[PDB]
């Protein structure tokens, strides 16, 4: 017998619609997110569940579900929030065309929570961010209202799973209003692929 | 001495003026990295300096120490060069970036130093382009300026004595067309990140 080592790593994606960086954006739907899965000597690509944790006309918050097998575990999560966009209809693959910024509000951060069948204890949660210089200008918009470029976090906790269960990770808010839209302006609504950030989840079994 | 890791972002101070001016590179450089020993999470400096220089560009190099033994080395290089102002009020707020050249000769690489044998070198370089019409501080990406130059590198090192290898970086471009910082009237110092480098050593 041996203590199991599990990890997930990957970059969830969201397809959005944006016209001119004057107007709001329209968020696509969240669903399966391709991740790399590691369990001891096993490795493969799996899909994790994502959906909206909350949604309003202003913003929407994403959450990502992670399976905890039966057992006791210490979890370490590394998140790097950055939301660069690229045009879906761009003839070339993946040429970045700007990004969506974050609110500087104190309630905006990466967090975790319990889903079916799991007890979270020992939550330690360090959130950091990168700010734009006020006179920074991306596609003719500035950063004078303190919009943020990045929101990162490193989280650790213990988790007891009496049975096979799930916890969820909450991302920072996806801002819908034009204040935070730094995408290239287009004539009519144009699909863009938005990155939601690099997430690394590690689970060490304790026995 | 079974597991050793370095992870950090080397810094370089630059000076930049207007958008039609070159940038001027500072000196390299001790670079503070996070240092990892199996279960220990400490900090260390590594040695960086210039592999080459010309009027157009400069290539940086970083030395990583390799204890005596036989090691699996995997390196993730995430090349991105955002800039921030060096002086308050806006230290550490992003004020632009320095883009890369699309030339085929510009890429992350490693080399041997001090009686040390690198074998089974696998080096995979990638890049990310900007949409031509993407605009940063009134400057576009219409000459195939690259935002990102990345590399995954794996190899084996045989270290009979304590030694080191060196990681050579993509070239730092000095000319105006790669300068996407906020313009000023006087030469204004910026701190430039040189990329996130993750170096892991596994003893065998």
């Amino acid at each position: 017998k041996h203590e199991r080592f599990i990890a997930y790593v990957g970059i969830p994606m969201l397809t959005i619609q944006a016209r001119e960086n004057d107007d709001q954006i329209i968020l696509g739907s969240l669903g399966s997110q391709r991740m790399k899965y590691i369990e001891d000597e096993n490795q493969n690509y799996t899909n994790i569940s994502s959906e909206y944790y909350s949604q309003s006309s202003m913003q929407a918050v994403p959450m990502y579900y992670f399976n905890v097998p039966k057992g006791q575990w210490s979890v370490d999560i590394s998140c790097e929030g950055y939301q660069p966009t690229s045009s879906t209809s761009d003839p070339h693959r993946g040429r970045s065309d700007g990004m969506i910024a974050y609110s500087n509000a104190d309630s905006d951060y990466w967090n975790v929570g319990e889903a079916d069948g799991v007890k979270i204890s020992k939550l330690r949660n360090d959130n950091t961010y990168r700010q734009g210089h006020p006179e920074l200008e991306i596609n003719s918009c500035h950063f004078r209202e303190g919009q943020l470029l990045e929101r990162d976090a490193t989280i650790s906790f213990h988790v007891e799973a009496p049975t096979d269960g799930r916890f969820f990770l909450v991302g920072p808010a996806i801002q819908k209003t034009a204040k935070y839209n730094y995408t290239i302006s287009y004539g009519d609504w144009t699909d863009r692929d938005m990155e939601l950030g690099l997430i690394t989840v590690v689970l060490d079994e304790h026995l | 001495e079974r597991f050793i890791a370095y992870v950090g972002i080397p810094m370089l101070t630059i000076q930049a003026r207007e958008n039609d001016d070159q940038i001027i590179l500072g000196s390299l450089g001790s670079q503070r990295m996070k240092y990892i020993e199996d279960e220990n999470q400490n900090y260390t400096n590594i040695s960086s300096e210039y592999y080459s220089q010309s009027s157009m560009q400069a290539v940086p190099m970083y030395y990583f120490n390799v204890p005596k033994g036989q090691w699996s080395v995997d390196i993730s290089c995430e090349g991105y060069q955002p800039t921030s102002s060096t002086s308050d009020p806006h230290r550490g707020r992003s004020d632009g970036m320095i883009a890369y050249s699309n030339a085929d000769s510009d890429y992350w690489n490693v080399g041997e130093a001090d009686g040390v044998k690198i074998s089974k070198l696998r080096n995979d370089n990638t890049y990310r382009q900007g949409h031509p019409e993407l605009e940063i501080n009134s400057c576009h990406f219409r000459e195939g300026q690259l935002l990102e130059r990345d590399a995954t590198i794996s190899f084996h090192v045989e270290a009979p004595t304590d030694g080191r290898f060196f990681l050579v970086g993509p070239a730092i471009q000095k000319t105006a067309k790669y300068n996407y910082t906020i313009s000023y009237g006087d030469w204004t110092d910026r701190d430039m990140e040189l990329g996130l480098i993750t170096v892991v050593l596994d003893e065998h």
Binding site: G94, E195, T200 | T126, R128
Partner: peptide
């Protein structure tokens, strides 16, 4: 930082030299 190898970043077209 971790024992997990970071993945190739998104929308990176691969350099075949």
């Amino acid at each position: 930082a971790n024992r997990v190898r970071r993945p190739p970043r998104e929308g990176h077209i691969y350099m075949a030299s």
